[PDB]
Amino acid sequence: ADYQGKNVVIIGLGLTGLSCVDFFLARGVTPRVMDTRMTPPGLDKLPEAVERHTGSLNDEWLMAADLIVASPGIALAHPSLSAAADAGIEIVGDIELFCREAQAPIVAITGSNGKSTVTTLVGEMAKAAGVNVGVGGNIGLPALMLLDDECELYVLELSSFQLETTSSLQAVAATILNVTEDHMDRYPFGLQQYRAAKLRIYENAKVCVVNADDALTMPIRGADERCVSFGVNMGDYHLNHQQGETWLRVKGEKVLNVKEMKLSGQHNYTNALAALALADAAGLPRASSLKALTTFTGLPHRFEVVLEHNGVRWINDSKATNVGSTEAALNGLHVDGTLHLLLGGDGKSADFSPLARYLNGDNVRLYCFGRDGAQLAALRPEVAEQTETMEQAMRLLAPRVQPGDMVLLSPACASLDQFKNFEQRGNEFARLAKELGGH
Ligand SMILES: Nc1ncnc2c1ncn2[C@@H]1O[C@H](COP(=O)(O)OP(=O)(O)O)[C@@H](O)[C@H]1O
Ligand SMILES: [Ca+2]
Ligand SMILES: [Ca+2]
Ligand SMILES: [Ca+2]
Ligand SMILES: [Mg+2]
Ligand SMILES: [Mg+2]
Ligand SMILES: [Mg+2]
């Protein structure tokens, strides 16, 4: 598309907004930019020529624009944007700009949880085939930074927020991995409104990879001839457990024993299935995609085995900052002895009731900490202890573990009451696991 001579206004000075600034400058267009923060981080990366307004939105700049490029962090429902829309001003996001320029096929991945794992895994499948693949879309690698005529395949992680402002995506393969009650400040009409944003990913997709276990991932008018499913018990791509072992199964055929993989957890096995389905649909060779499943290490803090010693597996799932992530960790969980489950932090008013279903059984102990520890201990008080900190909780459980046990940090909560971020929480857990369980 051609933006020469247009009055372009960008909202957001995070890395996404900065990537939009670069996009227009590279095309000889000098945009204006605004951010509601007084001192956004990206301010000191801007060139002198770019007019900027911080500390609020600038309504007259919006109402004068030919094109508004909105960060995913502001809602189309914000009054200033609604007023611009009412005036007929075009509002797009970075992904819309990307889709108008992309000259290679796009694999598009959304869902409440699992996006970065599946996106990274599809990217590894492409790399194993020797494809110059561009993987991005998260806040650390905005999609526009990937645009290059040398790129042969794009693999994008897309949020519901980005999909709301995107109309031109034509994915070769698209998935909604799952939909769980989250992000509800932005979706005041509930789960079906959150879903509706994600459902946009299937518009004009050639193949829709759907979750056989989550009906909210089905396209809006239902399953159609484009749909390929993945699931635990059944689907085009599913899991087979027999005689103590587990295999990935595709169209009625085992393709891989999961012992060849480096990932753990049933939900990571279904992530592997979704990735394989997407890669297959994209035209990547099956053999190299399976090879990638055997070499992919997984991402830090995503149900990550940081120590396996003396028959005890210590699992850093610090990125489980919400209930849906921890529920998926507990569902189908394989533990020979006792699960020592670490829950805690700032739960952001979540309903933890869903976790109760998994917390019966004589082989579970809860160790609850942080701001909302008392609420988490209440799930099942007779097997629960409460401490202030994660380290205190780990020192409580360490003398009790036995071969066959699992120590799982899957907090279901944000870390910011006690840590700088979830990476610091997971790194501290890994340090303590080695101190306390390594000998
Ligand atoms: N398919 C899934 N369903 C639910 N939770 C998942 C799934 N895949 C991974 N998770 C968990 O969600 C958290 C974030 O995983 P990640 O792959 O970073 O997702 P996202 O990029 O969507 O934030 C981790 O706790 C991880 O174990
Ligand atoms: Ca802003
Ligand atoms: Ca206490
Ligand atoms: Ca956090
Ligand atoms: Mg992500
Ligand atoms: Mg079901
Ligand atoms: Mg609170």
Side-chain angles (χ1 to χ4, degrees), residues 1-149 151-180 184 186-241 244-333 335-356 358-361 363-419 421-438:
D2 190 337
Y3 303 104
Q4 293 225 97
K6 289 185 186 316
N7 186 326
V8 177
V9 177
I10 299 161
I11 304 175
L13 272 176
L15 200 53
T16 303
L18 289 174
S19 81
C20 296
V21 175
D22 169 77
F23 173 86
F24 288 106
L25 296 173
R27 285 161 178 71
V29 175
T30 304
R32 291 209 270 198
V33 71
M34 63 185 68
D35 193 292
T36 57
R37 298 171 287 177
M38 188 56 73
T39 293
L43 205 49
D44 62 1
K45 332 295 180 96
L46 288 175
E48 193 177 33
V50 168
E51 271 213 293
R52 81 290 308 266
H53 170 101
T54 67
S56 60
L57 300 181
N58 183 319
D59 290 333
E60 59 267 24
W61 285 9
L62 295 171
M63 298 308 300
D66 299 306
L67 181 66
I68 293 165
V69 184
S71 165
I74 179 173
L76 295 180
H78 178 300
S80 291
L81 273 191
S82 300
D86 291 341
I89 302 159
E90 185 178 13
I91 297 161
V92 303
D94 73 307
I95 298 302
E96 176 58 15
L97 297 176
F98 176 88
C99 289
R100 300 170 170 188
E101 308 301 331
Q103 310 299 343
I106 298 167
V107 174
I109 292 145
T110 193
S112 294
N113 292 292
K115 297 181 291 300
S116 62
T117 294
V118 171
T119 298
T120 301
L121 181 45
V122 176
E124 295 298 298
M125 294 171 172
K127 292 175 199 197
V131 176
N132 181 21
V133 59
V135 186
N138 60 290
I139 40 56
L141 208 303
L144 289 173
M145 294 183 59
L146 301 171
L147 276 175
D148 194 286
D149 274 343
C151 187
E152 301 164 345
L153 179 69
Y154 297 103
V155 185
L156 304 180
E157 163 183 356
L158 301 177
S159 66
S160 63
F161 308 132
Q162 294 170 303
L163 285 163
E164 291 185 59
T165 53
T166 304
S167 51
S168 292
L169 176 66
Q170 302 198 63
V172 69
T175 185
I176 304 169
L177 295 172
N178 46 69
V179 181
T180 52
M184 285 305 149
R186 283 277 291 264
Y187 297 109
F189 293 93
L191 193 59
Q192 288 299 319
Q193 181 185 26
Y194 174 48
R195 185 195 179 214
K198 293 192 174 305
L199 287 174
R200 301 176 64 80
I201 203 172
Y202 294 141
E203 197 68 44
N204 297 312
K206 300 262 185 123
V207 171
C208 301
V209 174
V210 302
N211 183 342
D213 294 315
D214 189 344
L216 292 201
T217 72
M218 299 294 136
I220 185 169
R221 305 291 136 97
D224 58 45
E225 59 182 24
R226 302 176 296 159
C227 289
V228 172
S229 67
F230 70 91
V232 177
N233 288 333
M234 65 188 289
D236 294 293
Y237 294 68
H238 64 259
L239 305 180
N240 177 274
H241 193 116
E245 294 194 310
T246 304
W247 295 265
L248 311 180
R249 204 160 168 267
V250 179
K251 296 197 171 285
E253 315 273 337
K254 303 173 178 173
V255 303
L256 185 73
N257 191 313
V258 300
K259 80 197 186 310
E260 297 273 32
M261 303 182 66
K262 300 184 177 153
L263 304 180
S264 297
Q266 175 181 102
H267 62 298
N268 275 326
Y269 302 152
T270 63
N271 290 338
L273 295 176
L276 189 63
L278 290 162
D280 283 346
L284 290 170
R286 168 67 68 72
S288 39
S289 298
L290 297 175
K291 178 64 165 16
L293 291 175
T294 75
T295 65
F296 182 60
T297 68
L299 298 173
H301 320 287
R302 282 77 155 185
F303 206 83
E304 177 189 6
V305 185
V306 291
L307 177 65
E308 186 168 346
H309 187 244
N310 282 340
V312 179
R313 278 169 301 154
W314 300 71
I315 301 187
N316 167 21
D317 197 27
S318 187
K319 197 161 190 286
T321 59
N322 61 79
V323 169
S325 291
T326 297
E327 188 173 354
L330 300 175
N331 190 83
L333 185 50
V335 181
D336 288 303
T338 300
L339 169 67
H340 304 261
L341 176 61
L342 291 152
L343 302 172
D346 178 9
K348 306 178 304 298
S349 310
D351 178 11
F352 299 118
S353 283
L355 304 180
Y358 309 87
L359 300 178
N360 298 98
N363 71 332
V364 187
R365 301 283 322 177
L366 305 174
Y367 306 85
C368 304
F369 62 88
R371 178 67 69 190
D372 291 327
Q375 299 151 227
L376 294 159
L379 302 174
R380 187 172 176 206
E382 60 270 28
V383 308
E385 308 230 43
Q386 190 191 342
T387 59
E388 180 186 331
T389 73
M390 186 184 67
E391 174 167 359
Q392 286 163 357
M394 297 182 70
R395 290 185 186 283
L396 226 52
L397 68 86
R400 312 180 180 172
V401 301
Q402 292 298 321
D405 287 7
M406 174 185 294
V407 182
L408 177 57
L409 172 70
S410 188
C413 299
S415 76
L416 303 185
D417 59 324
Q418 298 174 317
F419 303 88
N421 52 46
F422 73 85
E423 294 106 312
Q424 188 184 55
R425 183 173 56 192
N427 290 332
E428 182 73 346
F429 173 87
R431 184 179 70 72
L432 287 164
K434 283 142 167 148
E435 152 107 301
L436 299 165

